[PDB]
Amino acid sequence: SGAIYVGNYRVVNRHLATHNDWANLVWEDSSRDLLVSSTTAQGCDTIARCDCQTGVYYCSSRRKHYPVSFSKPSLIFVEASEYYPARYQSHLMLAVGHSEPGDCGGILRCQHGVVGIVSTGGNGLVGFADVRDLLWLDE
């Protein structure tokens, strides 16, 4: 679990969005596993606007932060789950690191701010949904 809070927006994994997120929907994209909902309270997370390929992510299944080197956002094949059929997920960045399904939502950050959130994983792999291209999150 986990979300990004910026301006009057809440960014979460689409597969973990609540009834309240859908009732206050701003934008969603199944191909990216992202959903954005509106908030009444102001948020203070900063979104990175950069091309960093290194950062630190929060891993809730270990209660720890780990440094990672990750690939540039791309279309990556993701096996079927209870949430989606087998498909290419877009804007996904992979790295070597520990992740379990419940780790989705953990923030990936570089020195410029929030890069994305955990969205996929594998055996010794962790995948992050990029949010740096969503320029409208800042206006």
Six-digit token pair at 116? 């994305």
Q: Catalytic residue at 29? A: no
Q: Which of 2, 5, 8, 15 binds ligand A1BO3 (CB under 6 A)?
A: 15
Residue 59: strand, helix, or coil? strand
User: Within 24-63, which residues bind Zn ion (CB under 5 A)?
Assistant: 48, 50, 52
For residues 57 and 106, is the Cβ–Cβ distance under 8 A?
yes
* 112 in contact with ligand A1BO3 (CB under 6 A): no
Amino acid at 39: T
Determine whether 15 is an active site residue.
Answer: yes
Does 44 appear as a known binding residue?
no
User: Looking at beta carbons only, is 15 or 112 nearer to Zn ion?
Assistant: 112
Least distance between ligand A1BO3 and beta carbon 91 (Å): 11
Residue 73 binding ligand A1BO3, by CB under 6 A: no
Which option in Zn ion, ligand A1BO3, none does residue 120 bind, with CB closer than 5 to 8 A by kind? ligand A1BO3
* Residues 103, 61: Cα–Cα separation, whole Å: 6
- Sort 77 into a burial class: Cβ within 10 Å, 0-12 / 13-18 / 19+: exposed
**Residue 139 CB, nearest approach to Zn ion (Å):** 20
| Distances in whole angstroms, Cα of residue 114 to Cα of each of 19, 22, 51, 78, 111 | 25, 23, 12, 24, 9
Task: Using the minimum distance from each CB to Zn ion, give the nearer residue, 35 or 108.
Answer: 108
Q: Which residues are annotated as a binding site?
A: 50, 52, 110, 112
